[PDB]
Design a protein around this nucleic acid. Structure first.
Ligand code: MG
Ligand code: MG
Ligand code: MG
Ligand code: MG
Ligand code: MG
Ligand code: MG
Ligand code: MG
Ligand code: MG
Ligand code: MG
Ligand code: MG
Ligand code: MG
Ligand code: MG
Ligand code: MG
Ligand code: MG
Ligand code: MG
Ligand code: MG
Ligand code: MG
Lengths: 93, 107, 115, 96, 80
RNA sequence: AAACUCCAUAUAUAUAAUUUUAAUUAUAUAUAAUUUUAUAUUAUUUAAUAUAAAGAAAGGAAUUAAGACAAAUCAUAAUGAUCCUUAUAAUAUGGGUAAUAGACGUGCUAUAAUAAAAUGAUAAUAAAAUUAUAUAAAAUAUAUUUAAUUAUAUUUAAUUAAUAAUAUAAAACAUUUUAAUUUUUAAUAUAUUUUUUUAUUAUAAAUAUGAAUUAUAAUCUGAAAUUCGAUUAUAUGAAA
């Protein structure tokens, strides 16, 4: 019933001979939303990443400073504010 | 058929039908709620040739080609030359008719 | 209101009156009244050439038009009875009712289909 | 179609000018089919009949001399009277 | 209006007041196309019986309001 | 019951200035048959079989009695009794009638070669019926480099009709193709099977069947297509 990987005999690490797990890590450049680059060590092999949604473009982190897209595309000739004002009578609710 | 064996094809077919068509059939009956006593019954010309044709068709359907017309023609030529399981079936029918000699009513 | 079912005082049709019939008739009258206007509004709406704001306004107006302005809302009732199934247009009658009339001789010519 | 296109278009435009019919070479939705449709309203309105038809009420107006009897109405009245008599009349309507 | 030309299916609503002050819009339309002008407005769309509260995300922009208020109850069988 | 009746048939007459033409027609009025006659062969003057000569002469529809089934209908409609009368009567907005475990009828499409698909413009061959709450021709544009086909859009020519349109009927028939099928292909030669033959090499249980199911894009009707409509395209390609 319980899904498992059944253990083999464990390998005896002798006292003193235990070595620390130094994983393989690359120096990875993260360019944030704006052009601020930051180096971070990372295990996945990718020298450069550029981020779209970060703290540097989120309103919470700087208060002082594709269905919708599809809709925009195929109702473009009409150009859809003035339109809101036209189609917003607040009597019926 | 004609191309394979150069002699009137219609006549040859008619001959084949005559050969193959079993002259009588052991028709089954209920027989007043008892043993189903079979009787030899004579056949109309059409019935005789109808029996023959179905067998001919069956034997043609065992031949190779895509076109049925070709298969049919090959079968007809074979029958003209003198080789079929249809003949064997006819013989068997005749043997079965021969058993039940006096089961015929009017005699 | 109290004095009438619908907004506008329309006449009752002659002969067989029914609630459904009454409802239909009124609707038909309102359609007849406001046919040209509706057409004009539709035209204004479905126009690539005209200003978009105007077409939007026309569309809104069309949307806001009542139940009784709609052509699609009209349903051919039987006139003798008040049924709305198998209503033949050539004599505004229901199936059974038509047959009854036909056999009597009310539809002048209609007669048994003998071939 | 060996004959040129532009010439044919010009001819078509000329023909359109001659008659009243419009000339739409681009093939854009003009809205012509909305208006040009014959309006069917009066015929639709005339479905149930002529509402001004003579009734029993009028048969008193036209011929006061003849004391007519509407039979169905009289029957209905008699039924109502019978209902009243045997305690099966309509309950009095609420006003509020 | 489905066809790309002549769309979308626009209906009158109390939109601007909802935008100013968070008052949900009780729609009995169900055939009004959602627009970009109301994403993040609270709608209360009719279900036949009871009005259904929905907050319109940016994924809903193409669809009708009635598509998010499911009218029939989820079918089951009484295993007797 | 049969017969008179209608449709259809054959013939005759009438009418149609044979551009509303289809006279090879349409429609009024007749006549015509529930066919007749004779020679024979069986059974008793007749009746069935056969043969012959005379004829266009052969069908379908409507009509389904009395009684019964307390058969069906108070949801075509009406009426008796009974019940409701601020509600069981009346109007609007939305939803439902299209819900889905199993089951039951009717159909449709299928499971490929006596059977499916492409194509066929001096356009192979019909009938019946509809078009003032309309029928929509030609032609242009897009899907689509030619164009045709099919589908939409553009715009209404003609006719409210033996005159124009719906509408070049379709199977048929003919060439081509067709996996399962190394029962084929293509490289060489080969030749009096040349849209083909032979030789030697390589070509290793749902398809080039079916069209359910779904994704996206468009179009149509309508004021409105989410529940819940119809097309077209590009994919998807269950079961059988
Ligand atoms: Mg009779
Ligand atoms: Mg002629
Ligand atoms: Mg009877
Ligand atoms: Mg009963
Ligand atoms: Mg009964
Ligand atoms: Mg009653
Ligand atoms: Mg009633
Ligand atoms: Mg009520
Ligand atoms: Mg139903
Ligand atoms: Mg049935
Ligand atoms: Mg097939
Ligand atoms: Mg055309
Ligand atoms: Mg014509
Ligand atoms: Mg053709
Ligand atoms: Mg299978
Ligand atoms: Mg297929
Ligand atoms: Mg197919």
């Amino acid at each position: 019933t319980r899904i498992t990987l059944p253990r083999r005999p464990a390998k005896k690490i002798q006292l003193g001979k235990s070595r620390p797990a130094i994983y393989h890590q690359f120096n990875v450049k993260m360019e944030l939303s704006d052009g601020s680059v930051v180096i971070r060590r990372s295990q996945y092999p990718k020298g450069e990443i550029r981020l779209i949604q970060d703290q540097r473009n989120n309103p919470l982190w700087n208060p002082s400073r594709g269905s919708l897209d599809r809709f925009n595309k195929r109702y473009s000739s009409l150009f859809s504010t003035v339109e809101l004002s036209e189609e917003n009578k607040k009597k019926t609710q | 058929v004609y191309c394979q064996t150069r002699q009137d094809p219609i006549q040859a077919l008619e001959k084949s039908l005559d050969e193959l068509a079993p002259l009588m059939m052991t028709k089954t009956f209920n027989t007043g709620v008892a043993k189903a006593s079979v009787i030899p019954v004579p056949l109309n010309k059409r019935q005789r040739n109808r029996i023959a044709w179905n067998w001919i068709v069956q034997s043609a359907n065992q031949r190779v080609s895509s076109d049925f017309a070709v298969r049919l023609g090959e079968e007809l030529t074979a029958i003209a030359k003198g080789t079929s399981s249809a003949f064997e079936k006819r013989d068997q029918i005749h043997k079965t008719a021969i058993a039940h000699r006096a089961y015929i009513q009017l005699k | 209101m109290g004095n009438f079912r619908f907004p506008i005082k329309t006449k009752l049709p002659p002969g067989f009156i029914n609630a459904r019939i009454l409802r239909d008739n009124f609707k038909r009258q309102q359609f007849k009244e406001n046919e040209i206007l509706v057409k004009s509004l539709k035209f204004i709406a479905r126009n690539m050439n005209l200003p978009t704001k105007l077409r939007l306004e026309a569309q809104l107006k069309l949307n806001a038009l009542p139940n009784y302005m709609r052509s699609t809302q009209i349903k051919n009732r039987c006139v003798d009875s008040g049924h709305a199934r198998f209503v033949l247009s050539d004599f505004r009658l229901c199936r059974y009712q038509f047959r009854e009339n036909a056999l009597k001789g009310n539809l002048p010519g209609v007669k048994k289909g003998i071939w | 179609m060996n004959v040129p296109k532009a010439r044919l278009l010009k001819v078509a435009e000329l023909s359109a000018k001659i008659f009243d019919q419009n000339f739409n070479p681009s093939g854009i939705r003009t809205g012509s089919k909305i208006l040009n449709e014959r309006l069917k309203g009066p015929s639709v309105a005339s479905y149930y009949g002529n509402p001004d038809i003579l009734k029993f009420r009028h048969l008193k107006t036209l011929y006061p001399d003849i004391e007519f009897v509407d039979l169905e109405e009289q029957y209905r009245l008699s039924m109502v009277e019978a209902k009243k008599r045997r305690g099966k009349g309509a309950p009095k309507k609420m006003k509020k | 209006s489905r066809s790309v030309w002549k769309g979308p299916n626009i209906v009158p609503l109390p939109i601007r007041e909802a935008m100013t002050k968070g008052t949900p819009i009780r729609t009995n339309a169900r055939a009004a196309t959602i627009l970009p002008q109301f994403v993040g407005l609270k709608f209360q769309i009719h279900n036949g019986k009871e009005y259904v509260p929905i907050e319109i995300s940016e994924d809903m922009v193409g669809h009708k309001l009635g598509e998010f208020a499911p009218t029939r109850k989820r079918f089951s069988y009484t295993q007797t």
